[PDB]
Design an enzyme around this catalytic site. Structure first.
Site, short mmCIF file in Angstrom:
data_model
loop_
_atom_site.label_atom_id
_atom_site.label_comp_id
_atom_site.label_asym_id
_atom_site.label_seq_id
_atom_site.Cartn_x
_atom_site.Cartn_y
_atom_site.Cartn_z
N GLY A 78 0.65 -1.25 -0.32
CA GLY A 78 -0.23 0.10 -0.05
C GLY A 78 0.75 1.25 0.04
O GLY A 78 2.12 1.11 0.29
N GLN A 109 3.24 10.52 1.31
CA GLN A 109 4.38 9.61 0.94
C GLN A 109 5.14 10.61 -0.17
O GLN A 109 6.60 10.00 -0.27
CB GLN A 109 4.12 8.10 1.29
CG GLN A 109 4.25 7.29 2.01
CD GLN A 109 4.38 6.23 2.22
OE1 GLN A 109 3.13 5.49 2.17
NE2 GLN A 109 5.61 5.12 2.75
N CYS A 122 7.30 0.69 5.81
CA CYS A 122 7.28 1.54 5.34
C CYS A 122 8.23 2.10 4.55
O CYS A 122 9.19 2.39 4.94
CB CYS A 122 6.64 2.75 6.84
SG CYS A 122 5.93 4.43 6.33
N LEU A 123 7.86 2.28 3.33
CA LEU A 123 9.02 3.55 2.95
C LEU A 123 9.43 4.82 3.28
O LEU A 123 10.86 5.13 3.41
CB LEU A 123 9.10 3.86 1.57
CG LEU A 123 8.16 2.56 0.27
CD1 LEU A 123 7.58 2.32 -0.84
CD2 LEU A 123 10.20 1.82 -0.35
N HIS A 148 -2.72 1.31 8.40
CA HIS A 148 -1.01 2.57 8.17
C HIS A 148 -1.49 3.11 7.18
O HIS A 148 -0.92 4.20 7.68
CB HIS A 148 -0.87 1.18 7.41
CG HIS A 148 0.63 1.35 7.25
ND1 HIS A 148 1.96 0.84 8.38
CD2 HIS A 148 1.22 2.90 6.10
CE1 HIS A 148 2.70 1.40 7.96
NE2 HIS A 148 2.30 2.52 6.90
N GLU A 149 -2.38 3.67 6.02
CA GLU A 149 -2.26 4.28 5.02
C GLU A 149 -3.01 5.74 5.27
O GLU A 149 -2.58 6.71 5.15
CB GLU A 149 -2.84 3.84 4.00
CG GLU A 149 -2.01 2.61 2.96
CD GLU A 149 -0.17 3.25 3.39
OE1 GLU A 149 0.46 3.92 3.15
OE2 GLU A 149 0.24 1.97 3.31
N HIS A 168 -0.80 7.98 7.58
CA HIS A 168 0.12 9.15 7.39
C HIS A 168 -0.55 10.03 6.92
O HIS A 168 -0.04 10.38 6.68
CB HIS A 168 0.57 8.46 5.87
CG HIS A 168 0.96 7.32 5.91
ND1 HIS A 168 3.01 7.90 6.68
CD2 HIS A 168 2.10 5.36 4.92
CE1 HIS A 168 3.76 6.63 6.09
NE2 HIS A 168 2.71 6.06 5.40
ZN LIG Z 1 3.50 4.35 5.32
#
Ligand SMILES: [Zn+2]
Ligand SMILES: [Zn+2]
Ligand SMILES: [Zn+2]
Lengths: 159, 154, 159, 159
Positions: free
Chosen positions: A50, A55, A103-104, A145-146, A149
Site C-alpha cells: 500500500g 509519502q 514503511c518506505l 497504515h495508510e 499517514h
Molecule cells: Zn507507510
C-alpha cells in the site's frame, strides 16, 4: 511518461501533516488519475502493498490498498488494488491482531504493530462514487497504515 | 482542466520546504498535469502567480503570470518554473501592495527590483531569465511559498 | 440451530416461475424469520454471495445479498449481509459493468454478464419496515442476479 | 406465532410442479416444525381437511391429512391431524369410491371424484421416523388429493 515519485523519509515534516480532502473538482479528472497512476507505479517499483499520497509529497487524502503475496508476506491475500479517495474508517474491531509492518518512509526499521483485525471503511473511487466496505486481517492492517499517514502518523508511533 | 483546492494561512503545509522535482518527473505527464491544474487554478482565482504548496503539493513548481486583474499589473506571458533558484537579488528595492490566494488581508512588501532566476522547463531544460519590477516581486513571492514563507512575514 | 436446505438446479421448473410476494400477515412472523435463517445458513455453507427463496424451493420474493471474499468469489468486496423481503429495483443505471457470475443453481458453468453498475432498491425488512438502498459494483450485480431468480431468470439467459 | 399463508390458485404454475423431496437436514428442525405449523394454521383458518405445501408456494413434499366432521362432510371421521413428510402411496385398492371434493386452490368449483377406497402409504414424521399406514374411505381420499398436489395434479383433472 511513466513516473516513480521521490518518497519522503521520517524526519521530514510533510509526513506529520493532516492531508486535505480531495475536492469534487478533482473527481474523474486526468489530474487525479495521473496522481493515482504515479502513486501506483511508485508502490510497485518498490514492492509495496500500500501507499499514501503524503509519502510522495502530495498532502491529499488518497491511499492505495494492494495486498499480494511476496517473500515478505507469503500469507498475504490476492486482491485487486483499490485506490481510495477521502477514506474514513467507520469502525474498528475491538479484536486486535499483531502484524509485521515496514514503511518506505521509515527505511531500515520494521516492526510489530497492534491493529484492529477488522475495519469498516467509507471512501470515494477515482470516478467519485460513494463506497463502504469491510476489510479483514492484512488488508485491514494496510488500510489502518495508510490512513495513519493521512493523519500525520507513522507506524513507529504505534509501538 | 481542474480548479484545485487552496490552502490558507494557518495551514502547516504552507510552512514547509518544498521538495525538488526529481529527474524522472521531468517530462512526465504527471508533471504536465500538475502544472495544468496549477494554471487553471490560478486563472480562475485571478492570481498573478501560484506555487505548488498552495494546492497541497509540496514540490518546487511555480507559475509566474503577471496580468491586469481585479490590481493593474503589466501583462507577461505566463511562465512555469520547475526547481526555480534565484541566483541574484538586486540591492535596489521596490515597495508594493501584495495579496496572496493563501491569505484571503493585504500588505506592503520590500522586494528586490531585479531578480535573476535559473529554472527548469517542464521538459527539463535549464533557462536563466532576469525579471524587473512587479514580475520580479511575483517570482520572489512564489519562491517564498516554496520555502515556507508567506508574504505577511515581511 | 440452523439448517442447510437442498438447492434446485438449472432445468428444474421452480426456477422459472414468478415468485409470489410475501403477504402482510407473514411479515414479522417466526415463519419468515425461520425462512430467512435457513436461507442464510444454506448460502454460507455453500460459499454463496447471494441467495433467493426459489433456489431452496420456496416460491416467495425473499433474497439475501451478502458480498464477501470466499473460494467461489476470491476478490469480492465484503458487506453486511442484507435480507430483502419483496425487493423492487426502482432504478437501474445506464452505466453497465461486465463481470463473471455463478449461481448455486447452475453447477460448473460460470459466465460473463452485463449488469447495471448502480441499482436503487426498495425492500421490506423481515419485521416489515420499508428501506431504500443504492448499490454499486459487485453488490449491485448480486441484487440484479437474485431479483432475476424471483422472476424466473437464470444468469445464463443474460449472455 | 400465528400465520395464515396465502394460497396459490389454479392457473398459477407452482401447482403444476413435482415438489422436491424434503431432505435429511430439514427433519427435526425448527424450520420444518414452523413450515408444518403455518400449513396447519392455513388449513384450519378455512375449515380444510387437508393441505399440501405447494398450495402455499412451498414446492416441497409435505402434506397434512386432517379429517373431521363438518357441515360440508358430516359423517367424516374424527382423526388426529397427521403431517406427512415425503409420502409415497404404496398400494391403491382397485375398489373405487366416489367422493365430493373441493380445494382452496380451486375456488367456486367443487365436484365429484373417483378415488381408490383404500391406500397404503409410507411417510416420514416431522422427527423423521419412517411410518407405513393404511387409510380407508375419506382419509384415504384426502391422502390421494394432497399427494396429487405434490405431483402437480389438481382434482378437476381427475374428472
Ligand atoms: Zn507507510
Ligand atoms: Zn501567494
Ligand atoms: Zn387441494
Amino acid at each position: 511518461m511513466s513516473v516513480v515519485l521521490p518518497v519522503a523519509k521520517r524526519g521530514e515534516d510533510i509526513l506529520k501533516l493532516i492531508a486535505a480532502p480531495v475536492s469534487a473538482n478533482e473527481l474523474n479528472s486526468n489530474w487525479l488519475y495521473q496522481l493515482a497512476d504515479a502513486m501506483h507505479a511508485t508502490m510497485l517499483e518498490r514492492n509495496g502493498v500500500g501507499i499514501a499520497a503524503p509519502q510522495v509529497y502530495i498532502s491529499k487524502r488518497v491511499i492505495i490498498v494492494a495486498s499480494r503475496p511476496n517473500p515478505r508476506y507469503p500469507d498475504a491475500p490476492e486482491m485487486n488494488a483499490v485506490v481510495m479517495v477521502n477514506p474514513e474508517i467507520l469502525e474498528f474491531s475491538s479484536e486486535m491482531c499483531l502484524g509485521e509492518e515496514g514503511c518506505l518512509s521509515v527505511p531500515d526499521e520494521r516492526g510489530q504493530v497492534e491493529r484492529a483485525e477488522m475495519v469498516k471503511v467509507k471512501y470515494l473511487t477515482l470516478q467519485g462514487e460513494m463506497v463502504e466496505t469491510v476489510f479483514q486481517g492484512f488488508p485491514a492492517r494496510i488500510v489502518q497504515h495508510e490512513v495513519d499517514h493521512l493523519n500525520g502518523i507513522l507506524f513507529v508511533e504505534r509501538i
